[PDB]
Amino acid sequence: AKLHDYYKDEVVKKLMTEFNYNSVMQVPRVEKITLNMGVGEAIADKKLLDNAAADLAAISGQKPLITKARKSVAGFKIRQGYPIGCKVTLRGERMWEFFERLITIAVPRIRDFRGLSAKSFDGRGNYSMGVREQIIFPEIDYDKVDRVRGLDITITTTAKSDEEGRALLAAFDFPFR
Amino acid sequence: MKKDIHPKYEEITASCSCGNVMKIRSTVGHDLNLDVCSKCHPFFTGKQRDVATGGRVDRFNKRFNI
Amino acid sequence: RSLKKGPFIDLHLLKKVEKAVESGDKKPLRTWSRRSTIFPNMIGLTIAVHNGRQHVPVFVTDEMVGHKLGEFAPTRTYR
Amino acid sequence: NPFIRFEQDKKLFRNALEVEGLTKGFDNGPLFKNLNLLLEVGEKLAVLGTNGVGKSTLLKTLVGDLQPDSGTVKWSENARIGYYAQDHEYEFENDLTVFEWMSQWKQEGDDEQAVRSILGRLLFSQDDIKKPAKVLSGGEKGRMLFGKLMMQ
Amino acid sequence: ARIAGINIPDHKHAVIALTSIYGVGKTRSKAILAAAGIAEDVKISELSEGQIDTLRDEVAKFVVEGDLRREISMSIKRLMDLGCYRGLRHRRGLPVRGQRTKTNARTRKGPRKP
RNA sequence: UCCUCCUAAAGAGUAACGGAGGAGCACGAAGGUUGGCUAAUCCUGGUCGGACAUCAGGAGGUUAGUGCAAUGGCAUAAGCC
RNA sequence: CCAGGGCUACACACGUGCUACAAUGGCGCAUACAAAGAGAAGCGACCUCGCGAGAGCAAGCGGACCUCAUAAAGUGCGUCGUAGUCCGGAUUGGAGUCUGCAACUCGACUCCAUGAAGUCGGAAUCGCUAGUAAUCGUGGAUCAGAAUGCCACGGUGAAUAC
Ligand SMILES: [Mg+2]
Ligand SMILES: [Mg+2]
Ligand SMILES: [Mg+2]
Ligand SMILES: [Mg+2]
Ligand SMILES: [Mg+2]
Ligand SMILES: [Mg+2]
Ligand code: NA
């Protein structure tokens, strides 16, 4: 959509002249966005996981996949197959729409916003972020919700380094430091 | 998509309180009016306005009327 | 809390400050004055006050202006 | 011996019932006329009579699913009413399991305990928390009603 | 009935309904309403929506729920870090204005603990 | 009474009141077939979340797994939907 | 002799009290009725300033004349409609006023905001037989300032004692 053709028209040229590439598709491009939370407290209240899934469905136009514990761990008294988290993968048009609607409105609505860190890359151009609360998103009316559950946004790009990931994300008007 | 397991999805006009018309698809069911976007967010204008909590010698001086 | 005009301190410390400000930071001042407020010409000093039996060297930081010298010398030991 | 224990969500103080005049009637001259009385957060007042007097319809009027011909009952603004009907067939329906029926209640409780525990405190096991609600017999249905009261 | 935090009380007089705001009491509510041009005996649900908008800015010229809590917390946390006598009492949980703790001060201390 | 390894001397078998462990079952799918998939454990980044829950990349590669003891086997999977 | 501190410390326990938990009550408005006592390095009207504690000016009075000094419950009008509330007022932040060389330890009072426990109290226990109990206010001493205590005065005014 708007962010996608903005990228196509402007960011490709900007990054190409910035890094002195030689091919059109050597510029890093964002390939997916993953929104998940491991509710943890679904050991005993399975309705909590359904409420979180409804929250994610409201936030992003997809039905969340319920993720279960891979290995039994005795520390948190869970075993194999227990539904623990919810996850949504966004690609293409929906990814671009959510990318617009996050950094245009939802981030400004953060209480006492100061700026997202720049050293939060895994070393391969990927980004991760914790919203710490689900109420900021416009898809929420601040009264339907019952808890303080927060997401974990992960932006997966084809960048070859955290430097190029920083460059790509700063080409999209990210509120860094 | 997978044929009606998802919620609805449609274009909704989401403009700021200072103009800034922004047509964004979402799933709410009603147009919404909100605060400023990052276009008019007070982030680069209050960098020192936020860091102002302090000052005792200045408010002691005004108390020194004598 | 005290009065509308005339912030009250003791002379013997006021004159002792004027000798300390010129010489700068030095050995701490052993003053029994507790009922004297702090003035901006004392910031960064190392004045010492009386808690009843001994002097505790206090470091006058930025925010300790309106408070009194004895406000930072607790006078009873508990546990 | 089923271990049943009724708690109190919020304690009201002044008085609860304070009814003035009911005069409820169906076909004949009203089964009662005034019945002005107060509660004062007391205990019981065990209504009783003979068969066909109208104690059940008096309780229906008090609980409000039936309204009198003309009168006022009113309760305290903090009053929470649990009801155990004389006949309870409108409740055990819609083909739910014992677990689902007992979980449709409860205010803020985990799905696995504090609702599967109140069941086991009153003569129920894993092999019984999956049988349909509409098949239990008599005293078991009454005990389920007691459990819903204990959780409400 | 919607102000900075929430104006939950309908069915109440505007003078006392405004007290739900963390930062407005009785005299401040009278100060707010007097400059609003409305009487103090009007109910919230009865007054038109052409005055609630004129109230939000009149509430806004003061310090209210969202930021008053931060302001006072900074004041208490200052003394705690400052090391003042009030800070020491605030750290321990005892009276800070110099009253009896020999027998009284259960409000500041809490329930007894043998 | 039956099963697995060693003693058992590189075919089979081979004793002792020799050294170590198991069984008296389970399943109407945990069987048949077709289609699809690959694990343990460590690193970084991340909201509650910590050494360990869930998410994203990297290394690693079968060190995982097999209804149940041990041996042999298993990626064309005999493991997982 | 002097300066500073303590007598004011607090996991706790007891004795005597004050304010409450409300609707024969809170709040706002208007309007009545007292007794007793003090005052010269003292009581200080009236007027002006301040939302208020109070500040400036300031006559009169060492007094049945002048000040303290408006008594409060009450009465009439309206609202609140039994809610932790327009009951409650602790605790805390900010801003001040006046005595006093001096208010941190450790004063009183005013303003803004916050506004908790408490919804008639276990075993047990205390006071009172009439202008008394209960309830409402007023003054004095000690005192530069500093009482919910002590001593004293009046207003309203019961039930019961086979
Ligand atoms: Mg052989
Ligand atoms: Mg051989
Ligand atoms: Mg098998
Ligand atoms: Mg196959
Ligand atoms: Mg098979
Ligand atoms: Mg003493
Ligand atoms: Na009946």
Is E21:E5 a contact under the CB 8 Å cutoff? yes
> Strand, coil or helix: what is D43?
coil
User: What is the 3-state secondary structure of chain E?
Assistant: CCCCCCCCCCCCEHHHHHHHCCCCCCHHHHHHHHHHCCCCCCECCCCCHHHHHHHHHHHHCCCCHHHHHHHHHHHHHHHHHHCCHHHHHHHHCCCCCCCCCCCCCHHHHCCCCC
Handedness of CA A119, A19, A99, A86 (dihedral sign): negative
Question: CA–C1' span, E99 to G139, in Å?
Answer: 30
Do chain B and C touch: 3 or more Cβ pairs under 8 angstroms?
yes
What's the token pair of residue A170?
């700063």
Distance, CA A71 to ligand 3 centroid (Å)? 21
**Is residue D139 part of an annotated ligand binding site?**
no
Of A113, A116, E59, C3, residue with least CA distance to B65: C3
Which residues have CB under 8 Å from D18's CB, separation 6+? D38, D39, D73, D74
Backbone phi and psi for residue E10, each to the nearest 5 degrees, phi listed first: -85, -170
Q: Give whole-number Cα distances, D148 to A155, B28, D75, D99, in Å.
A: 48, 37, 22, 12
Euclidean distance between CA atoms D119 and D113, whole angstroms: 10
- D19-49 in b/e form (b: 16+ CB < 10 A) is beebbbeeeeeebbeebeeebeeeeeeeeee
| Residue corresponding to tokens 């000052």 | B55
CA distance D86 to D80: 19
Q: Helix E49-60 vs helix E27-36: angle between axes, to the nearest 10 degrees?
A: 130
Could you tell me the residue ranges of all domains in chain A? 1-177
CA torsion, points A136, A141, A145, A151, in degrees to nearest 10?
A: -30
User: How far is the C-alpha of A41 from the C-alpha of A35, rounded, in Å?
Assistant: 18
Residue C58 CA to residue C64 CA, distance in Å, equals 11
Distance (Å, whole) CA D151 – CA E20: 33
Beta bridge pairs of residue C59:
none
Cβ-based neighbours of D96, under 8 Å, separated by 6 or more: D104, D132, D133, D134
Pairing of strands B23-26, A65-68: unpaired
Cα separation, E90 vs E76, in Å, equals: 8
Q: Which residues of B touch C5 (CB under 8 A)?
A: 65-66
For the purposes of burial, counting CB atoms within 10 Å of the CB of A98, is it exposed (0-12), middle (13-18) or buried (19 or more)?
buried
In contact, D83 and D104? CB cutoff 8 Å: no
Which residues of chain B are within 8 Å of residue C66 when distances are taken between CB atoms?
56, 60, 63
Q: List, in order, residues 6 or more apart from D15 with CB less than 8 Å away.
A: D38, D39, D40, D41, D76
Residues facing A32 on adjacent strands? A156
Question: CB burial class (10 A; 0-12, 13-18, 19+) of residue C66?
Answer: middle
- D33 and D23 Cβ atoms separated by less than 8 Å: yes
In the DSSP assignment, the letter for residue A76 is T
- Residues present in chain C in total: 79
Contact list in C for residue B55 (CB cut-off 8 A) is none
The number of angstroms, rounded, from the C-alpha of D29 to the middle of its chain's C-alpha atoms is 28
Question: In chain E, whose CA is at the least distance from the CA of C64?
Answer: E82
Backbone CA torsion sign across C46, C48, C49, C54 = positive
Cα separation, A131 vs A151, in Å, equals 6
- Technique employed here was cryo-EM
Are D19 and D12 in contact, with CB atoms under 8 Å apart?
no
d(CA A14, CA A20): 10
CATH number assigned to the domain covering A1-177: 3.30.1440.10
Q: Which nucleotide is nearest to E101 (CA to C1')?
A: G10
Which residues contact residue A63 at a Cβ distance below 8 angstroms, ignoring those fewer than 6 apart?
A53, A57, B2, B5, B6
How far is the C-alpha of D96 from the C-alpha of A141, rounded, in Å? 33
**Å from B27 to nearest chain C CA?**
52
Per DSSP (E only), the strands in C1-79 are 48-50, 55-57
* Contact (CB, 8 A) for A60 and A90: yes
Burial class (CB in 10 A: 0-12, 13-18, 19+), A105: buried
What would the two tokens of residue E19 be? 């007290």
Closest Cα in chain E, distance from residue C72 (Å):
5
Distance CA B64, CA C7 (A): 8
Alpha-carbon distance of C76 to D5, in angstroms, equals: 53
Q: Which of residues 94-113 of E touch strand G (CB under 7 A)?
A: 94-103, 105, 107-109, 112-113
Structure tokens at E13: 């007089």
Q: Which of A41, A61, B6 is nearest to A51 (CA)?
A: A41
User: What is d(CA D88, CA D133) in angstroms, rounded to the nearest whole number?
Assistant: 12
* Rounded Cα gap, residues A160 and A27, in angstroms: 10
d(CA A13, CA B11): 30
Q: Tell me the DSSP string of B5-56.
A: SSPP-EEEE--BTTB---EEEESSSS----S--TTS-TTSSSHHHHTT---S
The CA distance from B64 to A21, in Å, is 66
Q: Straight-line distance from CA E41 to C1' G155, in Å?
A: 36
Structural contact between residues A42 and A101, judged by C-beta atoms closer than 8 angstroms? no
| Rounded Cα–Cα distance for residues A139 and E112 (Å) | 48
Instruction: Determine how many CB atoms are found less than 10 A away from the CB of residue C17.
Output: 19
Cβ distance of A107 and B38 shorter than 8 Å: yes
Cα D102 to Cα A48, A135, D105, D148, E32, distances in angstroms: 18, 32, 6, 7, 51
- In the block, tokens 């009454």 appear at D142
